[PDB]
């Protein structure tokens, strides 16, 4: 595959979405990973329901608009036996009652795989599996203002992550400082933020922002 990977080119990724004011990044990261795994297994791209996750995955440990984990969402899809499409279960940006309807389930999983905490293992998973769910430290002012180039925040934490996003690929670009490698990351803050809603995060700089600390993907 190397030296660059961008799953968007092969049709594995839906357009950028927007979580709004709800702490539901975890649900967007999970549907992003499921969308890519379902594409791999069916050849069809269908946008999945974050709201279904926000409303129904509390039993698995998620906290609606107050946070959650992508693994818990994968556990929910396994336990529930399905997840509704985005069209059938739209996003409201607030936690509501569970209204899952099996008639509109368009995806499913059997569980999930946690990637070892190494950027090398993460690279192998992105190249060989597809888009991967990851948690990152996005709590700095530099991240709010990100617009171009490779993001690097010296104060980034490798262990305390507060946001869930989706790695769709990786690559390189010549740079003034020779820190040239990045992870291609799909965010859920709308298309206007960042580079069309994406951020190139520093790659191979000691697990910058913890990108490799809590990476996983659903088993379909």
């Amino acid at each position: 595959a190397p030296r660059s990977v961008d799953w968007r080119e092969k049709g594995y990724v839906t357009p950028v979405k927007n979580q709004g004011q709800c702490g539901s990044c975890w649900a967007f990261s999970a549907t992003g990973a499921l969308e890519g795994q379902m594409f791999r297994k069916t050849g069809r791209l269908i946008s999945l329901s974050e709201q279904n996750l926000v409303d129904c995955s509390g039993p698995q440990g998620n906290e609606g608009c107050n946070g959650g984990l992508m693994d818990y969402a994968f556990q929910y899809v396994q336990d529930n036996g399905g997840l509704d499409s985005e069209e059938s279960y739209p996003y409201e940006a607030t936690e509501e009652s569970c209204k899952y309807n099996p008639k509109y389930s368009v995806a499913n999983d059997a569980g999930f795989v946690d990637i070892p905490k190494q950027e090398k293992a993460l690279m192998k998973a992105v190249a060989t599996v597809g888009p991967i769910s990851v948690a990152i430290d996005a709590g700095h002012e530099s991240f709010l203002f990100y617009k171009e180039g490779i993001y690097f925040e010296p104060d980034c934490s490798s262990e305390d992550m507060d946001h869930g996003v989706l790695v769709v690929g990786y690559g390189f670009e010549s740079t003034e400082s020779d820190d040239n490698k990045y992870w291609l990351v799909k965010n859920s803050w709308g298309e206007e933020w960042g580079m069309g809603g994406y951020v190139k995060m520093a790659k191979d700089r000691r697990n910058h922002c913890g990108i490799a600390s809590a990476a996983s993907y659903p088993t379909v």
Binding site: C22, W26, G67
Partner: protein, 98 residues
């Protein structure tokens, strides 16, 4: 900390008090009451598509409230919006998301 979770509580800083002062006009409009000085005491933050601040404030007659304040992304000029609040809180009540 989980993705989208609230941070741990920290004492209010002058920057948090400034955010409270800036949104007071919105609070008075929604509650239809005036508050005089709302003093920020403690706060949590939460990353969303932007940032939410959960701020415990002390009001008159020693009443407390928890304010939720959304700081918009740069594309929306970082506009501060009071998106929710909880009234009749106690001094020691935990700041929890809502």
């Amino acid at each position: 900390m989980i993705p989208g979770g609230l941070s741990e509580a920290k004492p209010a800083t002058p920057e948090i008090q400034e955010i409270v002062d800036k949104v007071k006009p919105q609070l008075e409009e929604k509650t239809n009451e005036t508050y005089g000085k709302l003093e920020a005491v403690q706060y949590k933050t939460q990353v969303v598509a932007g940032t939410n601040y959960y701020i415990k404030v002390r009001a008159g007659d020693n009443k407390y409230m928890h304010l939720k304040v959304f700081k918009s992304l740069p594309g929306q000029n970082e506009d501060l919006v009071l998106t929710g609040y909880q009234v009749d809180k106690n001094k020691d009540d935990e700041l929890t998301g809502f």
